[PDB]
Design a protein around this ligand. Structure first.
Ligand SMILES: CCCCCCCCCCCCCCCCCC(=O)OC[C@H](COP(=O)([O-])OCC[N+](C)(C)C)OC(=O)CCCCCCCCCCCCCCCCC
Ligand SMILES: CCCCCCCCCCCCCCCCCC(=O)OC[C@H](COP(=O)([O-])OCC[N+](C)(C)C)OC(=O)CCCCCCCCCCCCCCCCC
Ligand SMILES: CCCCCCCCCCCCCCCCCC(=O)OC[C@H](COP(=O)([O-])OCC[N+](C)(C)C)OC(=O)CCCCCCCCCCCCCCCCC
Ligand SMILES: CCCCCCCCCCCCCCCCCC(=O)OC[C@H](COP(=O)([O-])OCC[N+](C)(C)C)OC(=O)CCCCCCCCCCCCCCCCC
Ligand SMILES: CCCCCCCCCCCCCCCCCC(=O)OC[C@H](COP(=O)([O-])OCC[N+](C)(C)C)OC(=O)CCCCCCCCCCCCCCCCC
Ligand SMILES: CCCCCCCCCCCCCCCCCC(=O)OC[C@H](COP(=O)([O-])OCC[N+](C)(C)C)OC(=O)CCCCCCCCCCCCCCCCC
Ligand SMILES: CCCCCCCCCCCCCCCCCC(=O)OC[C@H](COP(=O)(O)OCCN)OC(=O)CCCCCCCCCCCCCCCCC
Ligand SMILES: CCCCCCCCCCCCCCCCCC(=O)OC[C@H](COP(=O)(O)OCCN)OC(=O)CCCCCCCCCCCCCCCCC
Ligand code: SF4
Lengths: 318, 155, 70, 174, 99, 98, 115, 96, 83, 97, 233
């Protein structure tokens, strides 16, 4: 039965990724006075299937200068991390219930930077390596703000347990208590998934596709699935962290509906950023992180350590 | 018999391959702007599943939109070679078709079909975005009638 | 126009709803119709281990009340 | 399932043999992070949840990550491979066989005396029997860094600030 | 310390982590608290030279508590002697030891 | 002692041997140093958790942070050497023989 | 152990997706097809292109900041002590030292992507 | 609002902790008998297993001190089924 | 007067992020030392009963230790109920 | 009540295509379920529709025949199937069918 | 160890504005020199014109700046008319100015929107390419071709405007400023667009003059010069 739980978690997530491709294309199209996929199936509903089928029957050109061991290990690591990021998530009850769930997510997402450091190195070409190094530096630099923002927010939670976030946000959203940290967290999440003006590793008009140039068909498809799973997962984490839904122990379907709707709204906002802004330069986003986000994050961590102590509002640790 | 299963599988694979025709933006000259007009909202090539793609490693069709010069032909053949298969070439405009206005020039190759095999020849100088869209749908119908698995079953 | 984006969003919503509902219902099924007991600390684990021993059926969630002895 | 910490420790030592035989530093780093992951698992099996997750987040996702990033810049024109040297194979093979011989001896004898006396009676055997109550003893011990460990915080923070100053002194290159 | 600044200035800089029988958070006990306490109370103020011989029993008990080496030997003997009689079909473990 | 301790101490010995037996690259030796630190971390953690030395739970954190500071220093030294010679090869670090 | 089963399933399914992805398509490969992509020409290997001290410096500064973050992670449990004034003093001390490291790197060029 | 709520969550935790405190004498009394019964059952078995080992003497404390020593897992479950000792060692750690 | 006001003006006009961060950090530094509630937080932490309250033997002359949990002796949490 | 009228207009699009089968036929052939005014039918089976309240470029359309010159064209249609008489009206070179 | 990355490529790159080989060496992150390699679209136009009659050479100018077709053919027509000592009629001149300004709208839409798309603001490209499609319709209604009208000729224009064309041009133009507003609502004040354009590619006015710059590349540096005013045609 637990195996069935794992399967009924993984497979719907991959399906949601597949149709997130369609949803993103349609949202971009309608923001651009066009339609997007509306021919292949009703309202493009069979388009993700067409993409998945075409990709797995397309020739996966592997580079002659590629260390194939890591060339295939990188997609495995990426997709395995992208899937395992959902196992502690408290759609009302988690698959895996840990004391340190958000710490587990921080660690697992920090292991995901290897899939770029290994793909760029394995692909050789002597230039995709530079794009991979830029991506890794961006990822590790925004890990700092992710970690510190999570630390400051959880000082109202009292623990690293994600189920406790539901209890913490019973009467009020955590957004009303930490909105500046919410904006910085949301932009950090944007930057970590290489999205929006932070998509420097796959700049369509900067370096064509960067670290993913040599990957084609199948491994490219799995990398794409990993990225979109990470996008939906990060938006789910954001919804649980800042927009906690009311929970009825006798009707958890209500919480699930609430959470899914809020996660979809945040994902649609992620696609909304993509259609509205130009692209940051690499040094420009590094400057943003290091000289704008980091000082405010340090100050707000200070503030959120001081605040529960000076108001006798320290949460329980149980 | 077992030729019905092979025919159905061929139909499935050829529906998936023409429903996700991802082309490569080879905009050489004036024909490039009518192709991004077929990209524009009025025609919206994305509604057919025909996305705005990137590096030839994820492209299924080459659109030669513009004059090919002698200085430029080796690069066109290089990126054609780098396309994974199955791959198709659409020649768009008189210049790419057979040289066009510059047919008798010292520096112009007379038709991209001297460099690459071409599947569809879209006439016009430039062809209207609707003409290019017609060529794209005609290419889609070419893919629909391929019989790769039925060829294999009778080998 | 824009409401034709809604079918893909509905498919996404169903695919995202499935995991949470499945987790809740599997937890109810395998825990005696009640919520899966949470043991973050050794005291809760010891509570569950005592529960398993006294149930006689080696299941912590079979609850013995005052009908068992008193 | 009966033995989990022993497979984890044997794999730990195997990874140590792998990266300490020193192939090209990218494969050495891969071996080091495999060893770090299995060691984080080892200390997870001992109840050190926070410590193992620290291993992960800071060692494998921090320190390593930085190591592989820096190797990706200062390497060879053809970055080497494990196979390229017979010395790597010899060192790895000798380490693997000295692992196998000693684990077999300890398993079937339980009184080896390689420097230290050892008894492979199990690994669960040394665990004590008791309740930790309503808190993690590890977390309470580590959170005491700010109440009991004032001096430790002072010296560690000073050393980290000095580390920033020191790195900026050395790398200036004049 | 080479220069006992702590004992001159009355400061507790690192003596609090120096033994496991020192005060602990939430009064969580060390595993070998009593053994360490007895060895420390034996060896207090008589010098290391005297404490090495005159507190040997307490330190031996402490070391056994820390690394249960002799306990492990006795358990290993019981285990392997049990098997020594399973093969011959001599000893049947009782119901509460099999389920 | 239990056999996990045996394998952890064995890992430390292997890392020490790998560091003492050099090869061309400096990064390989630094990785051996890191392995030595990681084995020390795990040994300390096992000893501290097993004996329930609660205040000593923080010692592995301190060991990890200080050893990572040393690793940063060594990485900077390697980078300077490489900028001098284009490689991190230790055989170029021999001009102090005279 | 449930978590081990979950990790095994995730890794196994990812590798199976590799196997279908990397063996199912029909292949026909020649030399010029798999040549490295350089926008229509051949790439130059040159000699160890990934250089510049700034890429290494950001990694080192991230490492040191990550170490201080490791020092900050026990904070949610640290607020549960009776001796709250000492704990607050030390947590704020650590954060001032983080801010001081950032400021010192900032003022002494540091974080800059120079010429 | 968070002040109000976190203040309420602290009294609820005090109530839960006091429920545990009230229950603790029962659990301590039970654990003592359970541990003593397991130790004595091991003793009764080893009196049989060790009959023929020549210089063996059963019940012999490894420690010089006659003070009560809390047994390890090996002394408690060293003669029981792999599932039981696996539970007693890793059931809490693995429970997720 | 005008010098510090002008510096604050320039900082607010060109580096609002640093102004906000320094003000927030300064308040986080300063405000806890003035709060009446910091002592309350200390008291709440002290009143959380993690351990068992192991009893004492009344040797006589223990008139302030309760005897029973519901005797009018020993600390009271009535203050916490209304806070 | 305006969303009520939007839903009514959709439902009348279902009814305006002669039922659900006809609605799905035009949904899956033309990827469009608008109901226009029939201006005429050519000898090849193509039907031509105008709706002057649509914006320019959508106010006129053809639902292609399913059979033309011995070729099945239920799914496989193209703009070359429009005869020159209707080609002029369809591309708005004139206002007269 | 000077290994300045000599990435001497990028023709197939989507941001290469068509066909452009860039030979680039960087001192780490920053550009040290740019070496544009052109000729990838050299078709021998100037030699072919020598084999063409004066009328036969006019369509060659549509395909030089294939974003500003009618302006190129206006320039060629003005040159040929100056050599012929003849004068186009007033109505033809007004039509030429009107379609030159329509052409300027087309070209500026293409330039600004493709600049933004290369920077990473893809959305304004589509909104304005709809207006470009409408102006293509104007081109085709006057000449039968959407891009290469060949409409402005030495002596005037080929044929007169069809009835109702001025009304449609008026209908389009009365709404176009709202689209410029929407384009500016996305770019002009955006802190990311300005970060990618402010103080980037600064050219001195005197150095702009000595490098042969013209148009916006001159007036960007404050030079008050426009051929439509100083040397009107
Ligand atoms: C493909 C690459 C995948 C990389 C990541 C692999 C998973 C790592 C995380 C494992 C789970 C975890 O840390 O949970 C923390 C969490 C932390 O929270 P927790 O431990 O408090 O959870 C609740 C536990 N109680 C009830 C005691 C409070 O713990 C768990 O989820 C379970 C703890 C026991 C786990 C026992 C098995 C550990 C196996 C570790 C991995 C070993 C192999 C590593 C890779 C080796 C590669 C060669
Ligand atoms: C009693 C109360 C005490 C506590 C008070 C706490 C402080 C209150 C006042 C602070 C307000 C500001 C908070 C931080 C804001 C960001 C800081 C920063 O550097 O900003 C400027 C920075 C830098 O701006 P800049 O570039 O103009 O300035 C840089 C510095 N100078 C001025 C010197 C040039 O800008 C950004 O961060 C831009 C982000 C780009 C992406 C934009 C995304 C748009 C969509 C957002 C949607 C909503 C997000 C959240 C969604 C929901 C999530 C749950
Ligand atoms: C896996 C099952 C594979 C079954 C065989 C292949 C598929 C059917 C044949 C090929 C496709 C049809 C074709 O070629 O053209 C269209 C065909 C016509 O092709 P045709 O080639 O026969 O037409 C020839 C004649 N002309 C062109 C002139 C008309 O039309 C159809 O209506 C076919 C419908 C087939 C079934 C469609 C099912 C849709 C999906 C339903 C489930 C939802 C998706 C779930 C996916 C999984 C999610 C986890
Ligand atoms: C998400 C995706 C999940 C997995 C989805 C799997 C979908 C499976 C349906 C069929 C997939 C395509 C099968 C055919 C491969 C492409 C093709 O047309 O090959 C033609 C080729 C043609 O071979 P050939 O020998 O005639 O030509 C090759 C030689 N040249 C090119 C020089 C002429 O077919 C084969 O090579 C044999 C195919 C055997 C049958 C395979 C059936 C499907 C097996 C998987 C199920
Ligand atoms: C410059 C460094 C300044 C550090 C902060 C100043 C001292 C903070 C403080 O209250 O420390 C209390 C602490 C502890 O005293 P305490 O009064 O908080 O008592 C703590 C009691 N336990 C451990 C049970 C929680 O001071 C020290 O430990 C002194 C260490 C040396 C400080 C040298 C500073 C120079
Ligand atoms: C996911 C991982 C891979 C799964 C593999 C297993 C499934 C394989 C089959 C996938 C779908 C095949 C569709 C068959 C072809 C097809 O329908 O062609 C359209 C064909 C037409 O094909 P066509 O070739 O004429 O192309 C269209 C041309 N015009 C626009 C001119 C008509 O039409 C139909 O078949 C009509 C019915 C469509 C199918 C029913 C869709 C129902 C809604 C499903 C939504 C998605 C699930 C939720
Ligand atoms: C207590 C029990 C022992 C504890 C310690 C662990 C022992 C087992 C693990 C060994 C770990 C790895 C040992 C080898 C390390 C290594 O990289 O040695 C390199 C060394 C010289 O390398 P290099 O100069 O590059 O050779 C010429 C290349 N053209 O290579 C050589 O000089 C050649 C020999 C290579 C293999 C030597 C292995 C020796 C292991 C035992 C001795 C050291 C301890
Ligand atoms: C009334 C209440 C107070 C109001 C605020 C007063 C102080 C305002 C902030 C300080 C402004 C100092 C002047 C300034 O603008 O410095 C800018 C300067 C360079 O900035 P840069 O963006 O690199 O520009 C380079 C040139 N183009 O900057 C530098 O060169 C270095 C800047 C270093 C900043 C370090 C910040 C660390 C984190 C601080 C927040 C966390 C809390 C720390 C403790 C705070 C205690 C108060
Ligand atoms: S065919 Fe005509 S429009 Fe196309 S590139 Fe050639 S000259 Fe330009």
């Amino acid at each position: 039965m637990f195996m069935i739980n794992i399967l009924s978690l993984i497979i719907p997530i991959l399906l949601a990724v597949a149709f997130l491709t369609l949803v993103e294309r349609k949202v971009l199209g309608y923001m651009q006075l066009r339609k997007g996929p509306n021919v292949v199936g009703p309202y493009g509903l069979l388009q993700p299937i067409a993409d998945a089928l075409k990709l797995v029957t397309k020739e996966p050109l592997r580079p002659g200068t590629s260390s194939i061991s890591m060339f295939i290990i990188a997609p495995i690591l990426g997709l395995s991390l992208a899937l395992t990021m959902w196992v502690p998530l408290p759609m009302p009850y988690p698959l895996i219930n840990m004391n340190l769930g958000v710490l587990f997510m921080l660690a697992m997402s920090s292991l995901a930077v290897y899939s770029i450091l290994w793909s760029g190195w394995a692909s050789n070409s002597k230039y995709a390596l530079i794009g991979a190094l830029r991506a890794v530096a961006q990822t590790i630099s925004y890990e700092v703000t992710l970690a510190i923002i999570l630390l400051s927010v959880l000082l109202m939670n009292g623990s690293y347990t994600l189920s406790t976030l539901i209890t913490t946000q019973e009467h009020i959203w955590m957004i009303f208590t930490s909105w500046p940290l919410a904006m910085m967290w949301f932009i950090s999440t944007l930057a970590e998934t290489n999205r929006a003006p932070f998509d420097l590793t796959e700049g369509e008009s900067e370096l064509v596709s960067g670290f993913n140039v040599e990957y084609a068909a199948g491994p490219f498809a799995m990398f794409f699935m990993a990225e979109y799973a990470n996008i939906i997962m990060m938006n789910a984490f954001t919804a649980i962290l800042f927009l906690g839904a009311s929970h009825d122990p006798h009707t958890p379907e209500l919480y699930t509906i609430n959470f899914v709707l809020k996660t979809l709204a945040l994902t649609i906002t992620f696609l909304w950023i993509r259609a509205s802004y130009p692209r940051f330069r690499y040094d420009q986003l590094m400057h943003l992180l290091w000289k704008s986000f980091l000082p405010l994050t340090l100050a707000l961590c200070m503030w959120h350590i001081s605040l529960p102590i000076m108001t006798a509002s320290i949460p329980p640790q149980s | 018999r077992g030729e019905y299963v092979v025919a159905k599988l061929d139909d499935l694979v050829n529906w998936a391959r023409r429903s996700s025709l991802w082309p490569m933006t080879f905009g050489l000259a004036c024909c490039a702007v009518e192709m991004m007009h077929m990209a524009a909202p009025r025609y919206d090539m994305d509604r057919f599943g025909v996305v705005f793609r990137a590096s030839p490693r994820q492209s299924d069709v080459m659109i030669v939109a513009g004059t090919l010069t002698n200085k430029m032909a080796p690069a066109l053949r290089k990126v054609y070679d780098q396309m994974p298969e199955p791959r198709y070439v659409v020649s768009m405009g008189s210049c790419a078709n057979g040289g066009g206005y510059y047919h008798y020039s010292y520096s112009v190759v007379r038709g991209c079909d001297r460099i690459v095999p071409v599947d569809i020849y879209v006439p016009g100088c430039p062809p209207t975005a609707e003409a290019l869209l017609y060529g794209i749908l005609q290419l889609q119908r070419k893919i629909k009638r391929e019989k790769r698995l039925r060829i294999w079953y009778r080998r | 126009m824009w409401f034709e984006i809604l079918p893909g969003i509905a498919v996404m919503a169903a695919c995202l709803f499935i995991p949470g509902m499945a987790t809740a219902h599997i937890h109810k099924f395998t825990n005696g119709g009640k919520e899966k007991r949470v043991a973050h600390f050794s005291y809760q684990w010891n509570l569950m281990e005592r529960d398993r021993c006294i149930s006689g059926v080696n299941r912590y969630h079979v609850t013995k009340g005052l009908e068992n002895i008193d | 399932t009966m033995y989990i910490a022993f497979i984890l420790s044997t794999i730990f030592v195997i990874g140590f043999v792998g990266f300490s035989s020193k192939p090209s530093p990218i494969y050495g780093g891969l071996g080091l992070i495999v060893s770090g992951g299995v060691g984080c698992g080892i200390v997870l099996n001992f109840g050190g949840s926070f410590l193992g997750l620290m291993v992960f987040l800071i060692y494998l996702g921090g320190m390593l990550v930085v190591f592989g990033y820096t190797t990706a810049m200062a390497t060879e024109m053809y970055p080497e491979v494990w196979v390229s040297n017979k010395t790597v194979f010899g060192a790895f093979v000798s380490g693997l066989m000295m692992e196998f011989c000693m684990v077999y001896y300890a398993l079937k004898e339980e009184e080896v005396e390689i420097i230290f006396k050892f008894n492979g009676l199990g690994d669960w055997v040394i665990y004590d029997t008791g309740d930790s109550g309503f808190f993690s003893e590890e977390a309470m011990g580590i959170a005491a860094l700010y109440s009991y460990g004032t001096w430790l915080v002072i010296v560690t923070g000073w050393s980290l600030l000095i580390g920033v100053v020191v790195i900026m002194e050395i790398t200036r290159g004049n | 310390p080479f220069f006992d600044v702590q004992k001159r200035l009355g400061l507790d800089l690192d003596r609090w982590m120096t033994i496991q029988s020192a005060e602990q958070p939430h009064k969580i006990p060390g595993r070998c608290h009593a053994f360490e306490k007895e060895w420390i109370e034996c060896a207090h103020g008589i010098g290391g030279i005297r404490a090495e011989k005159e507190c040997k029993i307490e330190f031996d008990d402490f070391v056994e508590c820390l690394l249960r080496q002799k306990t492990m030997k006795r358990l290993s003997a019981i285990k392997r002697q049990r098997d020594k009689l399973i093969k011959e079909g001599k000893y049947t473990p009782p119901p509460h030891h099999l389920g | 002692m239990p056999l996990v301790y045996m394998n952890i101490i064995m890992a430390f010995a292997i890392a020490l041997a790998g560091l003492l037996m050099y090869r061309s690259h400096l990064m390989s030796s630094l990785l051996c140093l890191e392995g030595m630190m990681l084995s020390l971390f795990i040994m300390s953690t096992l000893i501290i958790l097993n004996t329930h030395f609660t205040l000593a739970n923080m010692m592995p954190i301190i060991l990890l942070v200080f050893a990572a500071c040393e690793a940063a220093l060594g990485l900077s030294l390697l980078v300077m050497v490489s900028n001098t010679y284009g490689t991190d090869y230790v055989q170029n670090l021999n001009l102090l023989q005279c | 152990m449930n978590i081990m089963l979950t990790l095994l399933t995730n890794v196994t399914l990812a590798s199976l997706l590799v196997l279908i992805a990397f063996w199912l398509p029909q292949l026909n490969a020649y030399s010029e097809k798999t040549s490295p992509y350089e926008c229509g020409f051949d790439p130059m290997g040159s000699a160890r292109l990934p250089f510049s001290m700034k890429f290494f410096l950001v990694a080192i500064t991230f490492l040191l900041f990550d170490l201080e973050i490791a020092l900050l992670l026990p904070l949610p449990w640290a607020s549960q002590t009776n001796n709250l004034k000492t704990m607050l003093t030390m947590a704020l001390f650590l954060l001032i030292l983080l801010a001081a490291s950032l400021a010192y790197e900032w003022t002494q060029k540091g974080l800059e992507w120079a010429e | 609002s968070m002040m109000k709520w976190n203040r309420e969550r602290r009294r609820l935790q005090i109530e839960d902790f006091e429920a545990r405190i009230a229950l603790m004498p029962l659990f301590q009394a039970e654990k003592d008998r359970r541990v003593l019964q397991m130790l004595r059952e091991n003793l009764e078995e080893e009196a049989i297993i060790m009959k023929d080992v020549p210089d063996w003497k059963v019940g012999e404390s490894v420690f010089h001190t006659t003070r009560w020593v809390t047994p390890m897992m090996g002394e408690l479950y060293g003669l029981r089924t792999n599932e039981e000792i696996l539970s007693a060692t890793y059931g809490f750690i693995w429970y997720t | 007067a005008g010098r510090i006001a002008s510096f604050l003006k320039n900082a607010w006009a060109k580096e609002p992020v640093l102004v906000a961060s320094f003000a927030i950090g300064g308040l986080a530094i300063i405000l806890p030392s003035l709060s009446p509630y910091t002592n309350y937080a200390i008291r709440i932490n002290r009143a959380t009963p993690y351990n068992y309250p192991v009893p004492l033997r009344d040797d006589g002359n223990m008139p302030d230790v309760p005897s029973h949990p519901q005797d009018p002796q020993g600390p009271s949490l009535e203050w916490l109920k209304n806070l | 009540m305006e969303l009520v009228q939007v839903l009514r207009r959709g439902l009348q699009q279902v009814s305006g295509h002669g039922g659900l089968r006809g609605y799905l036929r035009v949904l899956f052939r033309a990827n469009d379920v608008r109901v226009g005014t029939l201006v005429g039918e050519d000898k090849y089976g193509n039907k031509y529709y105008e709706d002057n309240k649509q914006f320019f470029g959508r106010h006129r359309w053809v639902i292609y025949t399913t059979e033309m010159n011995g070729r099945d064209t239920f799914w496989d249609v193209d703009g070359s199937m429009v005869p020159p008489e209707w080609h002029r009206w369809l591309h708005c070179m004139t206002d007269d069918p | 160890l000077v290994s300045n990355l000599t990435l001497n490529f990028g023709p197939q790159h989507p941001a290469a504005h068509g066909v452009l080989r860039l030979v680039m060496e960087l001192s780490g992150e920053m550009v040290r020199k740019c070496d544009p390699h052109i000729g990838l679209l050299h078709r021998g136009t100037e030699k072919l014109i020598e084999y063409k009659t004066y009328l036969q050479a006019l369509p060659y100018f549509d395909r030089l700046d294939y974003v500003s077709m009618m302006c190129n053919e206006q320039a060629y027509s003005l040159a040929v008319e100056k050599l012929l000592n003849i004068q186009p009629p007033p109505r033809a001149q007004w039509i030429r100015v009107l379609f030159g300004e329509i052409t300027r709208l087309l070209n500026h839409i293409m330039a600004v929107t493709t600049h933004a798309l290369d920077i990473g603001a893809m959305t304004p490209f589509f909104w304005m390419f709809e207006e470009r499609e409408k102006m293509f319709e104007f081109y085709e209604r006057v000449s039968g071709a959407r891009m290469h009208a060949a409409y402005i000729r030495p002596g005037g224009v080929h044929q007169d405007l069809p009835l109702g064309l001025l009304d449609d041009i008026y209908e389009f133009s009365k709404n176009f400023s709202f689209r410029i507003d929407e384009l500016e609502e996305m770019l002009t004040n955006n802190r990311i667009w300005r970060n990618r354009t402010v103080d980037i590619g600064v050219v001195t006015a005197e150095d702009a003059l000595n490098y042969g710059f013209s148009g916006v590349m001159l007036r960007g540096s404050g030079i008050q010069w426009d051929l439509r005013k100083t040397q009107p045609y």
